[PDB]
Structure 1
Amino acid sequence: YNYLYRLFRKSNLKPFERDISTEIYQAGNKPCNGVAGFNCYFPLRSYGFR
């Protein structure tokens, strides 16, 4: 589980740009205010490498 990918982001990346900010993403109309839950997901998902 050491390898993760950014599933959620507000906008696309530029060429050769790196994003390591672990801020919450607002996937719905309701604000998240830094707390995950309904319509609030962490942007980073871990690969199930087996």
Structure 2
Amino acid sequence: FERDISTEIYQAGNKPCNGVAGFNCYFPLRSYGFRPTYGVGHQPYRVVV
């Protein structure tokens, strides 16, 4: 039960990756993939708590 909205790149090496990524540091956000041509187990559901 906490919120986190961060666009800063999370480093995964030794050099400080404040704004440079591509060699050894990864972006912490990735996109979803929802195609109708996918399987039944790869379909998006609109879930509410």
Q: TM-score, normalised by structure 1?
A: 0.58
Structure having the higher helix fraction is 2
Residue 34 (1) aligns with residue 30 (2):
no
> Which residue is 1:45 aligned to?
30
Relative contact order higher in (CA < 8 Å, ≥ 6 apart): 1
Q: What is the rounded CA distance, in whole Å, between the counterparts of 1:17 and 1:40 in structure 2?
A: 25
Q: What is the rounded CA distance, in whole Å, between the counterparts of 2:18 and 2:5 in structure 1?
A: 19
- Greater Rg, structure 1 or structure 2? 2
Structure having the higher strand fraction is 1
Identity of aligned residues (%): 100
Q: What is the rounded CA distance, in whole Å, between the counterparts of 1:45 and 1:20 in structure 2?
A: 14
**What is the aligned length?**
35
Misfit runs of 4+, over 3 Å? none
